[PDB]
Amino acid sequence: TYKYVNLREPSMDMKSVTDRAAQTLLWTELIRGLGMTLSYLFREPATINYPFEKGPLSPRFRGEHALRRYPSGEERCIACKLCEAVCPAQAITIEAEPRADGSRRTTRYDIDMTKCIYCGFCQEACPVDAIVEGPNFEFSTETHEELLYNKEKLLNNGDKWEAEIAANIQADYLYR
Amino acid sequence: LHHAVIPHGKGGRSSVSGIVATVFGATGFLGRYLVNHLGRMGSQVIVPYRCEPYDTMHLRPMGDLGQIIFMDWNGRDKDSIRRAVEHSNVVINLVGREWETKNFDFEDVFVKIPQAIAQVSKEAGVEKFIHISHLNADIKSSSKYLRNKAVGEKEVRETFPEATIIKPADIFGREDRFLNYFANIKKTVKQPVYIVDVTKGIINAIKDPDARGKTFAFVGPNRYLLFDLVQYVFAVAHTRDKVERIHTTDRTLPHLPGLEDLGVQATPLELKAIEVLRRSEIEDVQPA
Amino acid sequence: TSVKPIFSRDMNEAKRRVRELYRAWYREVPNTVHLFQLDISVKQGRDKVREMFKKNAHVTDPRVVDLLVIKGKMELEETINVWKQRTHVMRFFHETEAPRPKDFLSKFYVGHDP
Amino acid sequence: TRPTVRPRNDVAHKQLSAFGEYVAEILPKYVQQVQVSCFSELEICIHPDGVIPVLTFLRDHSNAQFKSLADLTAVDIPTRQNRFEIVYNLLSLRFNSRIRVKTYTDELTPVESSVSVYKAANWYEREIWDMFGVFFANHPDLRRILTDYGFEGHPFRKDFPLSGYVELRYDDEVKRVVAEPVELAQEFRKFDLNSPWEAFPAYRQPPE
Amino acid sequence: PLTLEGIKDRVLYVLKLYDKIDPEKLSVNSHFMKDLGLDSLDQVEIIMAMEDEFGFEIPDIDAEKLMCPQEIVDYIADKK
Amino acid sequence: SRGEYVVAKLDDLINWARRSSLWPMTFGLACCAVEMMHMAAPRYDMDRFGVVFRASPRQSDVMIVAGTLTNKMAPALRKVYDQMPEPRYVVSMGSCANGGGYYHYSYSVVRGCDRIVPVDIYVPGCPPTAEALLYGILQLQKKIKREKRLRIWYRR
């Protein structure tokens, strides 16, 4: 099951030895390499017009860390602490209290965007899919402190869109 | 008092110390070193910068997260300054320029700045108003710069008299001005003290209340001749009002509290001289 | 109770090793303090080296003493190399106070630090 | 029992069992335990004096070559007077099997510097010296790999906590990056997960 | 020119060069370990200072055999 | 009037010339280095934005700290950071660099390059998308647009 190479002799006939001498002294195959480079020079390249074109992606791409909520409903989370239980950097910090209305709530939902290794475990662990791995990848923050999302930060993040998120979930709720 | 101001644990790197300090200026020499000592102590610094954000951005990481806050101000308007001193515990003013501009004299920065910021300090009801000045800045002659700083001293004692007017001698450091004028190229009494003695005295006086109302003056531990200083700076090393100030005099005033009232050890010349004299022939004359 | 030691038969070889190592540390000071471009006097660093040697003075078992000899030998190797920079040599120095003395009262104000 | 259960075989089990019994017979001097795993990888628990005779015997002897040196670490276990475990893994080149020599030791008493028989032992040895603290007898070079030069304490141990005692930061006062004691912002919440009810009753040690 | 008195005089001025000793007190039977209060660390400092100033190897067991400046002069005059 | 106008348009011209090319050096320890060499990929260009990677620190105006900065490494990082021109700009790329992040514990690892150098652009991700990295680079150029250095120097 072994296929070894370079065990073949150069031929001691005059023919092949002066053909290799012509290769050595006459610069043949280097010019053949030039011809190969020119053959790829006369292509049209695979670039993108970056502020105008955005490249391909997946429906399962894991970005923004945004929240959802119910159809004409309340906040989707429960404070069941599964995401904090499985987060591999302990980047989740959920201080929770119930409100007096009976529906269980939080006080402070905390994601360290510094510490997030971008798994998907908090997506796959949330029973209601409150915390959702987001579709877009544009953070680019000038300051250090702004990389520490809070609860109402993520709520206003979810208030800008859900239809993208709902489309990705509707395409991706059957494979998992 | 209200919580989140009381100290907790050690100091430094987002520690909760006792103080919140609003610093005016801080882009240059001593304010930057004092921001570094506050980050060593682990407090929260309020710095308004009027200059380009590149300067405050490359002196940004000297503290930890939450330890600093940057804002914007002009030296003409009380509204931005009051917005700066909205919730402020203590406040220090550091000001001084080598030559005048087309928009600022030595007067009216040393006058119009501490009037306004001392005004909103006394209106805001804060403590430990610490304003710097220079040694032997007379009301009388020989320096426009020093008489303007003496007018600033008089006005800081005038409005909110419970303050600390603090004057060092001609201090030297890693980014000293006059020794840089000496290196890169008459009778004078002088005793320079090094910068860390001064800023340790400042942080001691700003973490030690009962200091409100007392004025300070700092002393170099040698008291020798400027000409021997030139001898030394060229021995190792192998404006007009500025040169007149450094050729005027630098004497001692033992009647206001200085060093050992604060209880701090002074640092000598030669150690920090061998430090900054990069890029052993020690004179050490020290007349009295 | 039969335990193999490192090198020595009593504390005499251990004292031999550690004083030869300290002699190497003392002769090893001036070349490196001129090479590293430092700013601390030779007396201060030499007194800190002998004070660090005097810190571990309460050890009598010769195995541990020979192990500290091996520790200081590795240290003197990495300082006779120019592998270690200014950072670790200044890290032996302790200039970042932390000013807390052994007063009960200074421990009372800065609380929870007995 | 048939589907989706990992298939094992008695063939490799009997071969490795007879071979381990054979090795224990032909070296009665340092063998203590010959345990055959159910997944057919041999372990041999060993006294720390004839380590170099064991390695010279296992490099050769023409009934099993084992020319391949591999993993060795003296895995940090407390509670034992002989704490550390030197496990030399040996992989054959002609016979395709894996044996482990787990000899025991404590902290202070040295093992005997296996570089004399295997050429690939040296950086492993220097690694174990800097990380655990296992000293060697007539060893060429003990330096520090994988750690800081000013750092101490043998940090892989259970003596050593999660954080260190050093924290680097630059200051412009003394114009360098200095090491300060630790200032943690987050707790490192240690989520205790040791639930009761004894899922594997076959591995229960006998109580008092 | 290496006289015994020359060795004694140079030992004298390099002990004067040594700072911590209080006073100099050139005693030919001094034993400054237990009669003046010096460490064996200070002992090996003094003997390696002799090693610095005027010559040979001086291994540390022979450094322990001196303990006293006149016996240092005697050992080096025997040795040099 | 004309003085402020000339200062404004001249500062616009020189800052445009700054944000034009900005050819960096690549520090790149761990797999964020692979992501930097894949924004050096043929698909996502760098030539279009004047970017050509060159490890010479004598001309590297922007510098990207990527990879796990360790406490064994960081003094050499500041050593390379020193010899560098008067505008110097730092892109903290990656979870390893933006605070330490995933290795925020685990001794002899710095808790992010903030403890060593300032950071002028933070870009999180593990790995960050090279497209997102290039977006942060365009935001860096717009920060270069928003400096008014010569305007401050005039109004001083």
Ligand SMILES: NC(=O)C1=CN([C@@H]2O[C@H](COP(=O)(O)OP(=O)(O)OC[C@H]3O[C@@H](n4cnc5c(N)ncnc54)[C@H](OP(=O)(O)O)[C@@H]3O)[C@@H](O)[C@H]2O)C=CC1
């Ligand atoms: N031996 C010495 O060096 C002595 C120093 N001092 C004091 O030390 C401090 C530092 O001195 P140095 O570094 O030489 O000088 P700097 O100009 O660098 O420091 C003064 C600080 O205040 C700011 N500032 C000063 N004047 C104005 C103004 N008109 N408008 C706005 N901001 C102003 C400066 O610039 P910016 O506005 O950009 O922040 C800087 O932040 C000064 O306060 C000086 O009075 C006093 C006596 C002796």
Ligand code: SF4
């Ligand atoms: S797993 Fe979901 S419901 Fe549970 S605490 Fe996290 S976000 Fe809330």
Ligand code: SF4
């Ligand atoms: S994707 Fe981020 S927040 Fe979610 S579990 Fe992983 S590290 Fe934690």
Ligand code: SF4
């Ligand atoms: S942040 Fe993630 S992708 Fe980047 S170097 Fe670290 S482990 Fe690799």
